[PDB]
Amino acid sequence: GRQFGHLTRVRHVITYSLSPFEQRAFPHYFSKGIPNVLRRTRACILRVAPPFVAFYLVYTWGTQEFEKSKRKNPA
Amino acid sequence: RIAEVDARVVREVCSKYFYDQCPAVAGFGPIEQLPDYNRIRSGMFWLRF
Numbered sequence: 001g002r003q004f005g006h007l008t009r010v011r012h013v014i015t016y017s018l019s020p021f022e023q024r025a026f027p028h029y030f031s032k033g034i035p036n037v038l039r040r041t042r043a044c045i046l047r048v049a050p051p052f053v054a055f056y057l058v059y060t061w062g063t064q065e066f067e068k069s070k071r072k073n074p075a
Numbered sequence: 076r077i078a079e080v081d082a083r084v085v086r087e088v089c090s091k092y093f094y095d096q097c098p099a100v101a102g103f104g105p106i107e108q109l110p111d112y113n114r115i116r117s118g119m120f121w122l123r124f
């Protein structure tokens with residue numbers, strides 16, 4: 001295990017904190033929240049979306065072929 | 076003003092200012108083991124009471 005007081009070394013760093021009864025738990029939830037969600041999705045969409053679009057195209061083609069491959073031809 | 080004080084007085088007076096109140100904390104030095112403020116704040120009441 002590991003304990004507080006034996007983790008690492010830190011110097012010259014100040015932390016200011018406020019009590020949770022002095023502040024609001026939902027401050028600017030929609031005012032600042034939505035623009036941050038847009039930035040987060042914008043920053044990662046190009047890395048996540050393409051492979052799942054690639055899956056979507058294979059999925060529709062493969063079923064479209066199979067769904068009609070067992071249709072009959074005049075010959 | 077002192078002789079008035081008995082045990083009932085300190086319990087009433089202390090609870091008025093200490094019990095379930097938000098403290099101000101100040102730390103300086105090797106204070107990695109200084110408890111987090113939420114933990115400090117929970118030390119200002121007893122669930123048994």
Ligand SMILES: CCCCCC(=O)OC[C@H](COP(=O)([O-])OCCN)OC(=O)CCCCC
Pocket residue numbers: 117118119120121122
């Ligand atoms: C049947 C009743 C059981 C009571 C359990 C209990 O109160 O645990 C402690 C904390 C809140 O007390 P505190 O951390 O402020 O400490 C107060 C110090 N005076 O509560 C929780 O967050 C624990 C969650 C448990 C989930 C299993």
